Every structure is written in structure tokens, then in C-alpha cells.
Amino acid sequence: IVGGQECKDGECPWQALLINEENEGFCGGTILSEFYILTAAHCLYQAKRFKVRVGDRNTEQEEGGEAVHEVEVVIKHNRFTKETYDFDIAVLRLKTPITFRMNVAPACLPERDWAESTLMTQKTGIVSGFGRTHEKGRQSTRLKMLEVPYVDRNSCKLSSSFIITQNMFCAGYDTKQEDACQGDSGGPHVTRFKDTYFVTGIVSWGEGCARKGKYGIYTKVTAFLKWIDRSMKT
Amino acid sequence: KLCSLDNGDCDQFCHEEQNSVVCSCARGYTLADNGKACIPTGPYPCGKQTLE
Ligand SMILES: O=C(N[C@H]1CCC[C@H]1NC(=O)c1ccc(Cl)s1)c1ccc(-n2ccccc2=O)cc1
Numbered sequence: 001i002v003g004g005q006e007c008k009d010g011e012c013p014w015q016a017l018l019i020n021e022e023n024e025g026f027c028g029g030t031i032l033s034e035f036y037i038l039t040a041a042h043c044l045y046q047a048k049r050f051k052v053r054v055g056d057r058n059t060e061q062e063e064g065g066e067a068v069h070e071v072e073v074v075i076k077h078n079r080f081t082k083e084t085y086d087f088d089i090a091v092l093r094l095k096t097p098i099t100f101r102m103n104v105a106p107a108c109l110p111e112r113d114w115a116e117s118t119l120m121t122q123k124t125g126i127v128s129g130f131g132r133t134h135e136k137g138r139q140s141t142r143l144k145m146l147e148v149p150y151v152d153r154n155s156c157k158l159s160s161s162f163i164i165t166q167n168m169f170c171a172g173y174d175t176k177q178e179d180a181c182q183g184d185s186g187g188p189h190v191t192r193f194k195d196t197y198f199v200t201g202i203v204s205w206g207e208g209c210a211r212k213g214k215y216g217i218y219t220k221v222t223a224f225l226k227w228i229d230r231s232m233k234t
Numbered sequence: 235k236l237c238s239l240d241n242g243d244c245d246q247f248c249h250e251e252q253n254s255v256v257c258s259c260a261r262g263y264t265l266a267d268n269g270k271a272c273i274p275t276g277p278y279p280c281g282k283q284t285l286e
Pocket residue numbers: 082083084085135162163179180181182183185203204205206207208209210215216217218
């Protein structure tokens with residue numbers, strides 16, 4: 001995350017962190033239920049064997065609320081390709097159920113029609129992650145969040161040098177220096193409605209970070225609600 | 235506007251059936267007796283920050 005703020009105690013309980021064999025985070029994810037995690041398909045390439053950590057807000061030390069979970073089944077969408085980055089979505093079924101507590105709780109899955117009409121028409125969304133604080137730099141050791149405005153679909157298609165498919169949407173600022181970055185991929189993008197946070201996106205990609213004339217690209221969750229449903233059964 | 239009018243007074247999901255407002259909740263919530271509010275069934279309902 002570039003810009004934005006630190007997630008304070010209990011503010012982003014649905015954040016998950018994929019860690020490699022060296023216990024270092026390479027990507028993010030979203031808690032969907034005691035057994036399921038939502039993330040990006042391109043993250044499944046950032047490492048061979050990885051685990052999921054929840055309840056963490058500061059990577060440097062261990063507060064006592066963290067928990068590492070092993071992945072039982074990896075469910076990546078079969079239409080994903082690094083050539084386009086379309087269908088950038090995956091679901092992880094954990095071996096052990098997540099125990100909800102302070103800083104550990106699921107985000108809500110909304111109904112398609114209502115979400116597109118009521119959530120994505122709101123002004124902004126919320127993105128989070130332990131990613132880079134500057135286009136060039138080391139990952140963050142603190143969990144950060146950032147409010148990013150929904151960008152006109154036409155405006156973003158115009159500003160991109162790659163095809164924005166119907167499985168993606170843009171969020172961010174044209175010139176302002178705030179945006180997600182390397183390391184936040186697969187992380188959560190949620191939208192608030194009456195003090196309730198619904199999952200509306202998945203951190204997917206961007207041309208640089210916070211660059212002028214460039215926005216953030218997210219996987220459109222309302223496009224995969226049934227896919228997600230099936231995944232949480234098989 | 236029904237659903238287009240302040241979400242039809244629903245706490246969460248709003249649908250229009252028979253040209254009337256029908257509210258519904260996400261998994262883990264129960265529709266209250268007024269048929270509009272959504273009541274959580276556990277201590278860690280989805281979508282809520284754990285602020286306590
Ligand atoms: O790794 C990437 N960019 C990096 C830029 C700096 C670090 C990363 N920046 C991000 O990860 C995000 C920035 C802001 C968000 Cl949100 S995520 C990437 C950029 C472009 C594409 N890409 C898209 C469509 C088709 C082909 C294609 O190569 C894939 C991956």
C-alpha cells in the first residue's frame with residue numbers, strides 16, 4: 001500500500017497473508033468463512049508451497065493473536081493466463097477451521113444484483129495489504145488500508161495500455177499518490193454499507209504504483225459469485 | 235423507487251417481488267420481525283470489524 005493508513009486494532013479482521021517457506025509474505029487474501037480464503041490466481045505462482053496467516057497486523061514480532069493455517073485444496077480459475085490476467089481469482093480451502101476473534105473474522109459475500117446496484121455505485125472501496133509502500137522498496141511490516149474511489153469504466157479503459165475485461169474494474173486516483181502495490185495482490189477490496197463490509201474485489205494488477213494517469217485493477221467479485229459458491233462446496 | 239429509495243429501508247439485501255420490497259440477510263444473519271433489520275446469530279458475524 002502506498003499512502004493510506006495503518007489498520008488499527010480490529011479494523012481489517014478479514015485480511016489473510018500468504019507466506020512462503022521462509023515465513024515471508026508475498027501476497028494477500030480475504031477470509032470468506034472458517035474454511036475458505038479468496039485470493040488471486042497469479043499469486044499461486046509467486047511460490048510453490050505456502051501457508052495462510054490470519055490475525056497479523058505487525059510482521060516484525062508476534063502479538064499472540066496470529067495463526068498459521070495449511071492449505072488443503074487450491075482452487076484456481078482455469079481461465080487465468082499471465083498473458084491477459086483475466087479471471088484472476090482463486091479459492092483456498094484450509095485444512096483447519098479459522099477460529100474467529102479480535103482481528104479475525106470473515107467479510108460478507110453479497111448478492112450479485114444488489115451488489116452491483118448498491119455497493120459498486122458507492123463512491124469508494126477499501127483496499128489493504130502488507131505490500132510495498134513505494135513502487136521501489138521493501139514490503140511493509142505493518143498492515144495498511146486505503147480508501148480508493150471507484151473509477152469510471154470508460155475512463156480506466158482509456159487510461160490502460162492493456163485490455164480491461166468485464167472481470168475487472170478500476171479503483172484509485174488519477175494523480176494523487178495512493179494505490180496498492182507489489183505484495184498486496186490477492187488481497188481484499190471491500191465496500192461498506194451501513195457499517196457492514198462486503199467483498200467487492202481482489203487486488204490484481206497495475207502499471208507501476210500510484211502513477212499519474214494510472215489506476216488500480218481489481219478482479220470483479222460480483223462476476224464470480226456462483227463460481228465462489230461452487231468452490232466452497234467442492 | 236422501492237429498492238432504489240434508500241435500499242427500501244432494508245439493512246442489507248433488497249429485492250422487489252410483486253412490485254414490493256423484500257429484504258434478506260447474508261449468511262449468519264437473521265431477518266428481524268419487522269422484515270427489514272438483520273440480526274447476527276454469533277459473536278463474529280461477517281462484515282463487522284471486531285471492535286471491542
Ligand atoms: O506486477 C505487475 N505490476 C507491478 C507494478 C509495480 C508492482 C506491481 N504492481 C501491482 O501489483 C499493483 C499495483 C496496483 C494494484 Cl491494485 S496491483 C503487473 C503489471 C501489469 C500486468 N498485466 C496486466 C494485463 C495483461 C498483461 C500484464 O502483464 C501484470 C502484472
